[PDB]
């Protein structure tokens, strides 16, 4: 290990459900209650306050155990560049990463970024479930390119800003999702993740470089991977079935869910929110 990072006491997060904290509910109240095309309730009727999980989000676990405050920009659905996996938002707001750093930047209205607030971006996985579900024309290989460019840019533009701190996190492990196994695309998942998270650090490092920016990458992948080669030390017992079943209907949540990996079908549970909350925090003095 090398020294620790500095601490941190402003988190502003930006990225999908893997971070959203309220704000794809808060949205989705305003769109609903002002008649707008295509609305639907986010995230739904089987979530804890709003998250898109049975708990807090890796991102508010870290900002505890850092002793940071957070704003939270994340939108469940997000891709890396201007819209969301749900098409009917564009109409109303651009949620995907790029939107979101436009829309924190334009609230800052020419005053300066917080050059001690650490910048944390995850995003990507709705730009691999959107390809999908909607047949893409891109090759994988280039809609990792375009996912690995946008999230660059993304750095590039907070950076320019003022910008100073970021921790940008790696795609997790598409390839164990309960979707992408139903879906029989694990192998494209594996593709697509594996090209992401061999590009995007080393662009991050010469960014990181040419800018003077603390930039730490999170590798979710290799987290994952240790975590469900060694369950039983986290006290994990099913690491594939859903909690919480959706598909084709919302089902009984299971009794134990600190016991399980997944809640519904796309997303975490809160335990593993938290062990990868602390995962992230190792980087940080408190
Ligand atoms: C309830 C769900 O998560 S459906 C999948 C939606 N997603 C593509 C935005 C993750």
Not at 102 to 110: E, F, H, K, P, R
Request: glycine fraction near 8%; include cysteine; proline fraction near 5%.
């Amino acid at each position: 290990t090398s020294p620790l990072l500095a601490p941190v006491r402003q988190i502003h997060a930006f990225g999908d459900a893997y971070s959203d904290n309220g704000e794809s509910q808060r949205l989705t109240r305003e769109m609903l209650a002002k008649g707008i095309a295509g609305a639907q309730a986010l995230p739904g009727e089987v979530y804890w306050q709003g998250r898109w999980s049975n708990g807090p989000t890796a991102v508010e676990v870290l900002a505890r155990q850092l002793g940071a405050q957070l704003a939270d920009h994340a939108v469940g659905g997000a891709k890396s560049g201007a819209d969301n996996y749900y098409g009917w938002m564009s109409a109303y707001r651009h949620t995907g990463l790029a939107g979101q750093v436009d829309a924190y930047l334009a609230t800052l209205d020419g005053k300066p970024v917080d050059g001690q607030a650490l910048h944390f971006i995850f995003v990507s996985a709705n730009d691999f479930f959107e390809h999908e579900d909607f047949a893409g024309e891109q090759p994988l290989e280039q809609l990792a390119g375009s996912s690995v460019a946008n999230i660059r840019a993304a750095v590039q533009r907070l950076g320019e800003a003022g910008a100073r701190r970021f921790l940008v996190v790696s795609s997790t492990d598409l390839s164990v999702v309960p979707a992408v196994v139903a879906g029989n695309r694990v192998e494209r998942a594996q593709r697509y993740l594996q090209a992401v998270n061999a590009s995007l650090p080393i662009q991050l490092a010469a960014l990181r470089k040419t800018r003077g920016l603390e930039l730490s990458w999170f590798d979710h992948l290799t987290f994952s991977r240790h975590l469900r080669r060694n369950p039983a030390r986290y006290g994990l017992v099913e690491l594939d079935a859903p909690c919480q079943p959706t598909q084709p209907s919302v089902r009984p949540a299971c009794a134990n869910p600190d016991q399980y990996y997944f809640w519904d079908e796309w997303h975490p549970t809160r335990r593993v929110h938290q062990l990868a909350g602390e995962a992230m925090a190792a980087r940080y003095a408190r």
